[PDB]
DNA sequence: TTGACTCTCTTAA
DNA sequence: GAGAGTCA
DNA sequence: TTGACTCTCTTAA
DNA sequence: GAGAGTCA
């Protein structure tokens, strides 16, 4: 099994490679009518992606390193968290983008949490709009807002009460 | 079926049958430290469920009627909305529980909206905690809260900025 | 050891 | 959150 | 015609 | 949001 030093070396090589990805400046809503700026380190759209990286799905990548003749592979956003617990409250931990930009691999834009917590950030009002996440959001979620509901609650007769 | 008259008849028979489901009172968080009361009309746990109803999954049911000698079948919660557009902005419309209680078939607890809008209600602060849904929530979402994030954003080196 | 592809799986609406 | 088939 | 089961599918994290 | 195989 890989030692602590070996895991730290994997994290360090990953950071060195991701740090050379193109850095894209994005202006984003923070909530409360505030606007802020995020700097995403974006994996390229097509090969080559960077040393150790390969695409396993339309917006899925993996990081691969060979250590003492054994091939090791991780989801490309999971590498910053290899020294952390991998479950909590009986739920698997997932890499969660605070910038909501799947191509971004900036570890300052990632956290490590259940899939439900991860999904819920899509609707958060944001750090200046009422975010209650203990690990605070960096921006208002892209799906926050009044929504586009087509039809609301209704009945034709009188069989129901709310 | 095809005619507006036939659709209204389907909706009316569905309402009559669901109106005889047991009414279960649920006390719920509204947000803002307030509590309210919902009256859910709950489909039985096992057969028989009611005229026209059958279970296709652990918490999935279908309503079926024979019109013009043809069988017509629909998701059990979609029947109130048979006269509404079945898509919005190119996204499929779904039956969405405002009470977050899948066995409930009270149409006063249902709306018709995209799957994204539907999902997002799980994290809403609620009608007394800041809900901005244009079709307002009936309760705070069951997943609202600080979350249980295991690890936040971090880097080992100095290659990244937020 | 490495790159660039291939495939299928999990969750909860 | 969905659609559709097999039996009786 | 109605009931009670069976199976797989969609979406976007 | 994930893991794993093939081939050169
Ligand atoms: Mg996410
Ligand atoms: Mg729902
Ligand atoms: Zn980013
Ligand atoms: Zn938040
Ligand atoms: Zn209900
Ligand atoms: Zn709401």
mmCIF file of C-alpha atoms (C1' of nucleotides) and ligand atoms in Angstrom:
data_model
loop_
_atom_site.group_PDB
_atom_site.id
_atom_site.type_symbol
_atom_site.label_atom_id
_atom_site.label_comp_id
_atom_site.label_asym_id
_atom_site.label_seq_id
_atom_site.Cartn_x
_atom_site.Cartn_y
_atom_site.Cartn_z
ATOM 1 C CA UNK A 1 0.000 0.000 0.000
ATOM 2 C CA UNK A 2 1.151 3.528 -0.777
ATOM 3 C CA UNK A 3 2.857 5.297 2.132
ATOM 4 C CA UNK A 4 1.999 8.788 3.362
ATOM 5 C CA UNK A 5 5.088 10.155 1.599
ATOM 6 C CA UNK A 6 4.039 8.467 -1.647
ATOM 7 C CA UNK A 7 0.520 9.931 -1.434
ATOM 8 C CA UNK A 8 1.941 13.411 -0.773
ATOM 9 C CA UNK A 9 4.145 12.974 -3.847
ATOM 10 C CA UNK A 10 1.069 12.111 -5.963
ATOM 11 C CA UNK A 11 -0.739 15.217 -4.667
ATOM 12 C CA UNK A 12 2.325 17.364 -5.390
ATOM 13 C CA UNK A 13 2.735 16.087 -8.967
ATOM 14 C CA UNK A 14 -0.984 16.637 -9.550
ATOM 15 C CA UNK A 15 -0.763 20.239 -8.299
ATOM 16 C CA UNK A 16 2.308 20.932 -10.429
ATOM 17 C CA UNK A 17 0.509 19.705 -13.573
ATOM 18 C CA UNK A 18 -2.871 21.355 -12.856
ATOM 19 C CA UNK A 19 -1.114 24.629 -12.020
ATOM 20 C CA UNK A 20 -0.044 24.822 -15.659
ATOM 21 C CA UNK A 21 -3.598 24.481 -17.007
ATOM 22 C CA UNK A 22 -4.979 27.672 -18.615
ATOM 23 C CA UNK A 23 -6.264 30.063 -15.949
ATOM 24 C CA UNK A 24 -9.610 31.590 -16.895
ATOM 25 C CA UNK A 25 -11.082 34.578 -15.048
ATOM 26 C CA UNK A 26 -14.866 34.344 -14.512
ATOM 27 C CA UNK A 27 -17.150 37.009 -13.064
ATOM 28 C CA UNK A 28 -19.819 35.320 -10.925
ATOM 29 C CA UNK A 29 -22.841 36.193 -8.790
ATOM 30 C CA UNK A 30 -22.170 36.086 -5.038
ATOM 31 C CA UNK A 31 -25.761 36.701 -3.939
ATOM 32 C CA UNK A 32 -27.240 39.936 -2.644
ATOM 33 C CA UNK A 33 -26.648 41.593 -6.023
ATOM 34 C CA UNK A 34 -22.867 41.285 -5.459
ATOM 35 C CA UNK A 35 -20.481 40.212 -8.229
ATOM 36 C CA UNK A 36 -17.135 38.519 -7.622
ATOM 37 C CA UNK A 37 -14.265 36.907 -9.530
ATOM 38 C CA UNK A 38 -13.123 33.277 -9.651
ATOM 39 C CA UNK A 39 -9.970 31.973 -11.339
ATOM 40 C CA UNK A 40 -10.471 28.485 -12.740
ATOM 41 C CA UNK A 41 -7.638 26.213 -13.868
ATOM 42 C CA UNK A 42 -9.322 24.451 -16.764
ATOM 43 C CA UNK A 43 -8.341 21.070 -18.218
ATOM 44 C CA UNK A 44 -8.116 21.252 -22.051
ATOM 45 C CA UNK A 45 -11.124 20.299 -24.189
ATOM 46 C CA UNK A 46 -9.240 17.592 -26.113
ATOM 47 C CA UNK A 47 -6.081 15.529 -25.811
ATOM 48 C CA UNK A 48 -3.373 16.111 -24.693
ATOM 49 C CA UNK A 49 -4.682 17.168 -21.274
ATOM 50 C CA UNK A 50 -1.483 17.140 -19.212
ATOM 51 C CA UNK A 51 0.914 14.573 -17.797
ATOM 52 C CA UNK A 52 -1.025 11.785 -16.075
ATOM 53 C CA UNK A 53 -4.506 12.877 -17.240
ATOM 54 C CA UNK A 54 -6.971 11.105 -19.510
ATOM 55 C CA UNK A 55 -10.662 11.532 -20.330
ATOM 56 C CA UNK A 56 -13.036 8.706 -19.404
ATOM 57 C CA UNK A 57 -16.244 10.591 -20.182
ATOM 58 C CA UNK A 58 -17.599 13.791 -21.775
ATOM 59 C CA UNK A 59 -16.820 15.691 -18.559
ATOM 60 C CA UNK A 60 -14.990 12.978 -16.599
ATOM 61 C CA UNK A 61 -11.223 12.557 -16.247
ATOM 62 C CA UNK A 62 -8.773 10.358 -14.337
ATOM 63 C CA UNK A 63 -5.254 10.858 -12.978
ATOM 64 C CA UNK A 64 -2.813 7.925 -13.272
ATOM 65 C CA UNK A 65 0.614 7.297 -11.736
ATOM 66 C CA UNK A 66 2.765 4.156 -11.740
ATOM 67 C CA UNK A 67 4.526 3.542 -8.424
ATOM 68 C CA UNK A 68 6.871 0.586 -7.873
ATOM 69 C CA UNK A 69 5.580 -1.049 -11.072
ATOM 70 C CA UNK A 70 1.907 -0.795 -10.007
ATOM 71 C CA UNK A 71 -0.561 1.419 -11.870
ATOM 72 C CA UNK A 72 -2.711 3.598 -9.589
ATOM 73 C CA UNK A 73 -5.658 5.623 -10.874
ATOM 74 C CA UNK A 74 -7.979 8.205 -9.272
ATOM 75 C CA UNK A 75 -10.853 10.394 -10.363
ATOM 76 C CA UNK A 76 -9.194 13.593 -11.506
ATOM 77 C CA UNK A 77 -10.800 15.845 -8.863
ATOM 78 C CA UNK A 78 -10.322 13.378 -5.961
ATOM 79 C CA UNK A 79 -6.525 13.733 -5.697
ATOM 80 C CA UNK A 80 -6.453 16.733 -3.282
ATOM 81 C CA UNK A 81 -8.403 14.642 -0.772
ATOM 82 C CA UNK A 82 -6.410 11.387 -0.747
ATOM 83 C CA UNK A 83 -5.367 11.917 2.898
ATOM 84 C CA UNK A 84 -8.973 12.536 4.034
ATOM 85 C CA UNK A 85 -11.719 10.166 5.184
ATOM 86 C CA UNK A 86 -13.610 8.813 2.184
ATOM 87 C CA UNK A 87 -17.063 8.546 3.802
ATOM 88 C CA UNK A 88 -19.159 10.411 6.359
ATOM 89 C CA UNK A 89 -22.481 9.467 7.986
ATOM 90 C CA UNK A 90 -22.420 6.280 5.887
ATOM 91 C CA UNK A 91 -22.260 8.246 2.615
ATOM 92 C CA UNK A 92 -19.377 8.266 0.129
ATOM 93 C CA UNK A 93 -17.414 11.514 -0.153
ATOM 94 C CA UNK A 94 -17.384 13.207 -3.571
ATOM 95 C CA UNK A 95 -15.393 16.036 -5.114
ATOM 96 C CA UNK A 96 -17.670 19.071 -5.136
ATOM 97 C CA UNK A 97 -16.984 22.139 -7.303
ATOM 98 C CA UNK A 98 -17.558 25.415 -5.473
ATOM 99 C CA UNK A 99 -17.157 27.142 -8.865
ATOM 100 C CA UNK A 100 -19.617 24.747 -10.596
ATOM 101 C CA UNK A 101 -17.155 24.459 -13.518
ATOM 102 C CA UNK A 102 -16.497 20.771 -14.169
ATOM 103 C CA UNK A 103 -13.344 21.344 -16.240
ATOM 104 C CA UNK A 104 -11.802 23.349 -13.392
ATOM 105 C CA UNK A 105 -9.240 21.447 -11.301
ATOM 106 C CA UNK A 106 -8.263 24.332 -8.998
ATOM 107 C CA UNK A 107 -8.096 22.670 -5.533
ATOM 108 C CA UNK A 108 -9.100 26.010 -3.968
ATOM 109 C CA UNK A 109 -12.435 25.519 -5.807
ATOM 110 C CA UNK A 110 -13.080 21.972 -4.519
ATOM 111 C CA UNK A 111 -14.446 20.437 -1.363
ATOM 112 C CA UNK A 112 -15.045 16.859 -0.241
ATOM 113 C CA UNK A 113 -18.569 16.003 0.879
ATOM 114 C CA UNK A 114 -21.582 13.748 0.350
ATOM 115 C CA UNK A 115 -23.287 13.707 -3.058
ATOM 116 C CA UNK A 116 -26.395 15.304 -1.505
ATOM 117 C CA UNK A 117 -24.333 18.220 -0.089
ATOM 118 C CA UNK A 118 -22.586 18.485 -3.468
ATOM 119 C CA UNK A 119 -25.859 18.682 -5.440
ATOM 120 C CA UNK A 120 -27.425 21.122 -2.990
ATOM 121 C CA UNK A 121 -24.831 23.787 -3.713
ATOM 122 C CA UNK A 122 -26.483 24.202 -7.168
ATOM 123 C CA UNK A 123 -29.357 26.108 -5.509
ATOM 124 C CA UNK A 124 -27.485 28.012 -2.774
ATOM 125 C CA UNK A 125 -28.130 31.783 -2.568
ATOM 126 C CA UNK A 126 -24.380 32.349 -2.168
ATOM 127 C CA UNK A 127 -21.864 33.745 0.312
ATOM 128 C CA UNK A 128 -23.445 37.219 0.185
ATOM 129 C CA UNK A 129 -27.035 35.990 -0.164
ATOM 130 C CA UNK A 130 -27.559 33.716 2.845
ATOM 131 C CA UNK A 131 -25.350 30.639 2.437
ATOM 132 C CA UNK A 132 -25.464 28.432 5.547
ATOM 133 C CA UNK A 133 -22.977 25.800 4.332
ATOM 134 C CA UNK A 134 -20.352 25.310 7.047
ATOM 135 C CA UNK A 135 -17.726 25.160 4.301
ATOM 136 C CA UNK A 136 -18.963 28.330 2.628
ATOM 137 C CA UNK A 137 -19.907 28.575 -1.033
ATOM 138 C CA UNK A 138 -17.714 30.680 -3.305
ATOM 139 C CA UNK A 139 -20.660 31.825 -5.439
ATOM 140 C CA UNK A 140 -24.411 31.734 -5.797
ATOM 141 C CA UNK A 141 -25.495 28.395 -7.233
ATOM 142 C CA UNK A 142 -26.246 28.443 -10.971
ATOM 143 C CA UNK A 143 -29.805 27.168 -10.425
ATOM 144 C CA UNK A 144 -30.762 29.572 -7.612
ATOM 145 C CA UNK A 145 -33.852 31.650 -8.305
ATOM 146 C CA UNK A 146 -37.641 31.653 -8.654
ATOM 147 C CA UNK A 147 -37.665 28.713 -11.057
ATOM 148 C CA UNK A 148 -39.929 28.143 -14.042
ATOM 149 C CA UNK A 149 -42.805 26.096 -12.649
ATOM 150 C CA UNK A 150 -45.413 25.395 -15.334
ATOM 151 C CA UNK A 151 -48.410 24.619 -13.105
ATOM 152 C CA UNK A 152 -48.930 24.928 -9.360
ATOM 153 C CA UNK A 153 -51.040 22.996 -6.862
ATOM 154 C CA UNK A 154 -54.688 22.794 -7.857
ATOM 155 C CA UNK A 155 -57.826 20.660 -7.726
ATOM 156 C CA UNK A 156 -60.956 20.467 -9.866
ATOM 157 C CA UNK A 157 -63.375 19.446 -7.090
ATOM 158 C CA UNK A 158 -63.461 19.821 -3.300
ATOM 159 C CA UNK A 159 -61.991 16.468 -2.223
ATOM 160 C CA UNK A 160 -58.789 17.900 -0.746
ATOM 161 C CA UNK A 161 -57.483 20.298 1.871
ATOM 162 C CA UNK A 162 -53.866 21.423 2.053
ATOM 163 C CA UNK B 1 -57.190 10.185 -23.863
ATOM 164 C CA UNK B 2 -57.372 12.575 -26.800
ATOM 165 C CA UNK B 3 -60.507 14.704 -25.979
ATOM 166 C CA UNK B 4 -60.524 17.506 -23.376
ATOM 167 C CA UNK B 5 -63.724 15.882 -22.074
ATOM 168 C CA UNK B 6 -61.938 12.515 -21.775
ATOM 169 C CA UNK B 7 -58.953 14.138 -19.984
ATOM 170 C CA UNK B 8 -61.250 15.988 -17.525
ATOM 171 C CA UNK B 9 -62.992 12.657 -16.837
ATOM 172 C CA UNK B 10 -59.641 11.004 -16.136
ATOM 173 C CA UNK B 11 -58.676 13.825 -13.764
ATOM 174 C CA UNK B 12 -62.052 13.654 -12.012
ATOM 175 C CA UNK B 13 -61.953 9.874 -11.481
ATOM 176 C CA UNK B 14 -58.375 10.151 -10.214
ATOM 177 C CA UNK B 15 -59.367 12.886 -7.752
ATOM 178 C CA UNK B 16 -62.334 10.849 -6.519
ATOM 179 C CA UNK B 17 -60.150 7.791 -5.885
ATOM 180 C CA UNK B 18 -57.233 9.673 -4.296
ATOM 181 C CA UNK B 19 -59.721 11.611 -2.165
ATOM 182 C CA UNK B 20 -60.452 8.342 -0.342
ATOM 183 C CA UNK B 21 -56.789 7.633 0.498
ATOM 184 C CA UNK B 22 -56.098 7.909 4.245
ATOM 185 C CA UNK B 23 -55.369 11.489 5.294
ATOM 186 C CA UNK B 24 -52.179 11.629 7.358
ATOM 187 C CA UNK B 25 -51.251 14.794 9.217
ATOM 188 C CA UNK B 26 -47.568 15.788 9.073
ATOM 189 C CA UNK B 27 -46.055 18.601 11.130
ATOM 190 C CA UNK B 28 -43.232 20.214 9.179
ATOM 191 C CA UNK B 29 -40.554 22.902 9.447
ATOM 192 C CA UNK B 30 -41.421 26.096 7.573
ATOM 193 C CA UNK B 31 -38.126 27.885 8.099
ATOM 194 C CA UNK B 32 -37.640 30.817 10.431
ATOM 195 C CA UNK B 33 -38.156 28.582 13.468
ATOM 196 C CA UNK B 34 -41.842 28.127 12.544
ATOM 197 C CA UNK B 35 -43.806 24.893 12.142
ATOM 198 C CA UNK B 36 -46.862 24.100 10.027
ATOM 199 C CA UNK B 37 -49.242 21.264 9.272
ATOM 200 C CA UNK B 38 -49.777 19.390 5.993
ATOM 201 C CA UNK B 39 -52.506 16.838 5.236
ATOM 202 C CA UNK B 40 -51.160 14.184 2.867
ATOM 203 C CA UNK B 41 -53.474 11.741 1.068
ATOM 204 C CA UNK B 42 -51.292 8.635 1.142
ATOM 205 C CA UNK B 43 -51.535 5.671 -1.220
ATOM 206 C CA UNK B 44 -51.574 2.345 0.703
ATOM 207 C CA UNK B 45 -48.326 0.470 1.346
ATOM 208 C CA UNK B 46 -49.583 -2.707 -0.342
ATOM 209 C CA UNK B 47 -52.245 -3.852 -2.752
ATOM 210 C CA UNK B 48 -55.046 -3.012 -3.152
ATOM 211 C CA UNK B 49 -54.144 0.670 -3.707
ATOM 212 C CA UNK B 50 -57.366 1.980 -5.254
ATOM 213 C CA UNK B 51 -59.288 1.712 -8.504
ATOM 214 C CA UNK B 52 -56.924 2.291 -11.414
ATOM 215 C CA UNK B 53 -53.683 2.233 -9.376
ATOM 216 C CA UNK B 54 -50.795 -0.238 -9.444
ATOM 217 C CA UNK B 55 -47.238 -0.188 -8.091
ATOM 218 C CA UNK B 56 -44.393 -0.303 -10.629
ATOM 219 C CA UNK B 57 -41.569 0.411 -8.177
ATOM 220 C CA UNK B 58 -40.851 0.587 -4.431
ATOM 221 C CA UNK B 59 -42.157 4.181 -4.423
ATOM 222 C CA UNK B 60 -43.520 4.444 -7.992
ATOM 223 C CA UNK B 61 -47.167 3.962 -9.089
ATOM 224 C CA UNK B 62 -49.160 4.241 -12.341
ATOM 225 C CA UNK B 63 -52.814 5.179 -13.006
ATOM 226 C CA UNK B 64 -54.590 3.289 -15.813
ATOM 227 C CA UNK B 65 -57.968 3.733 -17.526
ATOM 228 C CA UNK B 66 -59.626 2.038 -20.520
ATOM 229 C CA UNK B 67 -60.946 4.672 -23.001
ATOM 230 C CA UNK B 68 -62.415 3.757 -26.421
ATOM 231 C CA UNK B 69 -61.394 0.115 -25.698
ATOM 232 C CA UNK B 70 -57.706 1.233 -25.394
ATOM 233 C CA UNK B 71 -55.698 1.202 -22.124
ATOM 234 C CA UNK B 72 -54.126 4.587 -21.262
ATOM 235 C CA UNK B 73 -51.546 4.706 -18.440
ATOM 236 C CA UNK B 74 -49.749 7.564 -16.672
ATOM 237 C CA UNK B 75 -47.359 8.106 -13.764
ATOM 238 C CA UNK B 76 -49.614 8.285 -10.676
ATOM 239 C CA UNK B 77 -48.710 11.918 -9.827
ATOM 240 C CA UNK B 78 -48.892 13.251 -13.411
ATOM 241 C CA UNK B 79 -52.678 13.030 -13.800
ATOM 242 C CA UNK B 80 -53.554 16.509 -12.369
ATOM 243 C CA UNK B 81 -51.410 18.094 -15.094
ATOM 244 C CA UNK B 82 -52.696 16.292 -18.204
ATOM 245 C CA UNK B 83 -53.859 19.621 -19.723
ATOM 246 C CA UNK B 84 -50.499 21.341 -19.230
ATOM 247 C CA UNK B 85 -47.488 21.589 -21.544
ATOM 248 C CA UNK B 86 -45.315 18.523 -21.031
ATOM 249 C CA UNK B 87 -42.057 20.441 -21.434
ATOM 250 C CA UNK B 88 -40.599 23.821 -20.566
ATOM 251 C CA UNK B 89 -37.530 25.403 -22.165
ATOM 252 C CA UNK B 90 -36.895 22.015 -23.781
ATOM 253 C CA UNK B 91 -36.884 20.169 -20.439
ATOM 254 C CA UNK B 92 -39.386 17.500 -19.438
ATOM 255 C CA UNK B 93 -42.032 18.538 -16.925
ATOM 256 C CA UNK B 94 -42.206 16.375 -13.784
ATOM 257 C CA UNK B 95 -44.593 15.988 -10.895
ATOM 258 C CA UNK B 96 -42.909 17.631 -7.911
ATOM 259 C CA UNK B 97 -43.918 16.994 -4.285
ATOM 260 C CA UNK B 98 -44.088 20.146 -2.197
ATOM 261 C CA UNK B 99 -44.548 17.875 0.857
ATOM 262 C CA UNK B 100 -41.543 15.680 -0.081
ATOM 263 C CA UNK B 101 -43.734 12.629 0.671
ATOM 264 C CA UNK B 102 -43.744 10.269 -2.303
ATOM 265 C CA UNK B 103 -46.817 8.232 -1.203
ATOM 266 C CA UNK B 104 -48.860 11.438 -1.050
ATOM 267 C CA UNK B 105 -51.161 12.068 -4.027
ATOM 268 C CA UNK B 106 -52.815 15.280 -2.730
ATOM 269 C CA UNK B 107 -52.831 17.546 -5.812
ATOM 270 C CA UNK B 108 -52.657 20.537 -3.462
ATOM 271 C CA UNK B 109 -49.157 19.229 -2.618
ATOM 272 C CA UNK B 110 -48.000 18.809 -6.249
ATOM 273 C CA UNK B 111 -46.611 21.097 -8.928
ATOM 274 C CA UNK B 112 -45.408 20.563 -12.503
ATOM 275 C CA UNK B 113 -41.865 21.736 -13.228
ATOM 276 C CA UNK B 114 -38.465 20.731 -14.574
ATOM 277 C CA UNK B 115 -36.528 17.981 -12.790
ATOM 278 C CA UNK B 116 -33.938 20.583 -11.767
ATOM 279 C CA UNK B 117 -36.622 22.783 -10.108
ATOM 280 C CA UNK B 118 -38.060 19.650 -8.459
ATOM 281 C CA UNK B 119 -34.713 18.532 -7.030
ATOM 282 C CA UNK B 120 -33.837 22.028 -5.844
ATOM 283 C CA UNK B 121 -36.786 22.182 -3.469
ATOM 284 C CA UNK B 122 -34.949 19.612 -1.289
ATOM 285 C CA UNK B 123 -32.606 22.398 -0.096
ATOM 286 C CA UNK B 124 -35.033 25.341 0.074
ATOM 287 C CA UNK B 125 -35.092 27.284 3.385
ATOM 288 C CA UNK B 126 -38.901 27.209 3.255
ATOM 289 C CA UNK B 127 -41.846 29.616 3.065
ATOM 290 C CA UNK B 128 -40.882 31.315 6.356
ATOM 291 C CA UNK B 129 -37.116 31.093 5.863
ATOM 292 C CA UNK B 130 -36.600 32.818 2.520
ATOM 293 C CA UNK B 131 -38.102 30.656 -0.228
ATOM 294 C CA UNK B 132 -37.972 32.516 -3.564
ATOM 295 C CA UNK B 133 -39.773 29.864 -5.639
ATOM 296 C CA UNK B 134 -42.480 31.603 -7.681
ATOM 297 C CA UNK B 135 -44.713 28.630 -6.917
ATOM 298 C CA UNK B 136 -43.986 28.747 -3.195
ATOM 299 C CA UNK B 137 -42.753 25.829 -1.115
ATOM 300 C CA UNK B 138 -45.029 24.346 1.543
ATOM 301 C CA UNK B 139 -42.120 23.473 3.864
ATOM 302 C CA UNK B 140 -38.404 23.813 4.365
ATOM 303 C CA UNK B 141 -36.591 21.217 2.262
ATOM 304 C CA UNK B 142 -35.506 18.100 4.175
ATOM 305 C CA UNK B 143 -31.837 18.596 3.164
ATOM 306 C CA UNK B 144 -31.595 22.274 4.108
ATOM 307 C CA UNK B 145 -28.766 22.991 6.521
ATOM 308 C CA UNK B 146 -25.006 23.393 7.023
ATOM 309 C CA UNK B 147 -24.047 20.037 5.506
ATOM 310 C CA UNK B 148 -21.312 17.688 6.718
ATOM 311 C CA UNK B 149 -18.322 18.597 4.551
ATOM 312 C CA UNK B 150 -15.277 16.458 5.389
ATOM 313 C CA UNK B 151 -12.597 18.672 3.827
ATOM 314 C CA UNK B 152 -12.631 22.161 2.372
ATOM 315 C CA UNK B 153 -10.569 23.825 -0.353
ATOM 316 C CA UNK B 154 -6.825 23.526 0.196
ATOM 317 C CA UNK B 155 -3.482 23.374 -1.577
ATOM 318 C CA UNK B 156 -0.070 22.082 -0.532
ATOM 319 C CA UNK B 157 2.014 24.486 -2.636
ATOM 320 C CA UNK B 158 1.654 28.032 -3.967
ATOM 321 C CA UNK B 159 0.385 27.466 -7.513
ATOM 322 C CA UNK B 160 -3.276 28.456 -7.067
ATOM 323 C CA UNK B 161 -5.421 31.471 -6.230
ATOM 324 C CA UNK B 162 -9.134 31.552 -5.563
ATOM 325 C "C1'" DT C 1 5.298 3.751 -17.737
ATOM 326 C "C1'" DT C 2 2.421 6.487 -20.453
ATOM 327 C "C1'" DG C 3 -1.455 8.309 -23.545
ATOM 328 C "C1'" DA C 4 -5.810 8.035 -25.607
ATOM 329 C "C1'" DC C 5 -9.308 5.931 -26.099
ATOM 330 C "C1'" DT C 6 -13.101 2.183 -24.606
ATOM 331 C "C1'" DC C 7 -16.887 0.421 -21.335
ATOM 332 C "C1'" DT C 8 -20.186 0.420 -17.311
ATOM 333 C "C1'" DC C 9 -21.640 2.149 -12.462
ATOM 334 C "C1'" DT C 10 -23.994 5.359 -8.201
ATOM 335 C "C1'" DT C 11 -27.508 8.344 -6.247
ATOM 336 C "C1'" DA C 12 -32.075 10.226 -5.526
ATOM 337 C "C1'" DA C 13 -35.240 13.229 -7.576
ATOM 338 C "C1'" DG D 1 -38.234 11.603 -11.443
ATOM 339 C "C1'" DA D 2 -40.279 8.125 -15.902
ATOM 340 C "C1'" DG D 3 -42.172 4.227 -19.777
ATOM 341 C "C1'" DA D 4 -43.678 -0.416 -20.891
ATOM 342 C "C1'" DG D 5 -44.574 -5.859 -20.661
ATOM 343 C "C1'" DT D 6 -46.456 -10.340 -18.327
ATOM 344 C "C1'" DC D 7 -49.861 -12.826 -16.392
ATOM 345 C "C1'" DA D 8 -54.690 -13.794 -14.262
ATOM 346 C "C1'" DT E 1 -61.684 -4.585 -18.026
ATOM 347 C "C1'" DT E 2 -59.212 -4.427 -13.906
ATOM 348 C "C1'" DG E 3 -55.542 -5.890 -10.751
ATOM 349 C "C1'" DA E 4 -50.881 -7.178 -9.325
ATOM 350 C "C1'" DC E 5 -46.886 -7.912 -10.421
ATOM 351 C "C1'" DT E 6 -42.238 -7.705 -13.604
ATOM 352 C "C1'" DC E 7 -38.454 -5.095 -16.075
ATOM 353 C "C1'" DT E 8 -35.651 -1.073 -17.688
ATOM 354 C "C1'" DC E 9 -35.057 4.158 -18.527
ATOM 355 C "C1'" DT E 10 -33.761 9.746 -17.541
ATOM 356 C "C1'" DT E 11 -31.165 13.408 -15.519
ATOM 357 C "C1'" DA E 12 -27.148 15.766 -13.698
ATOM 358 C "C1'" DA E 13 -24.402 15.867 -9.765
ATOM 359 C "C1'" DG F 1 -20.696 12.248 -9.148
ATOM 360 C "C1'" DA F 2 -17.462 7.209 -9.867
ATOM 361 C "C1'" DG F 3 -14.179 2.453 -11.194
ATOM 362 C "C1'" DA F 4 -11.907 -0.401 -14.587
ATOM 363 C "C1'" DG F 5 -10.035 -2.556 -19.525
ATOM 364 C "C1'" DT F 6 -7.320 -2.491 -24.086
ATOM 365 C "C1'" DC F 7 -3.440 -1.638 -26.819
ATOM 366 C "C1'" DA F 8 0.887 -0.045 -28.302
HETATM 367 MG MG1 LIG G 1 -21.351 19.801 -7.844
HETATM 368 MG MG1 LIG G 2 -39.219 16.233 -5.514
HETATM 369 ZN ZN1 LIG G 3 -13.020 26.719 -10.677
HETATM 370 ZN ZN1 LIG G 4 -23.828 27.634 0.193
HETATM 371 ZN ZN1 LIG G 5 -48.458 15.559 0.788
HETATM 372 ZN ZN1 LIG G 6 -38.853 27.178 -2.005
#
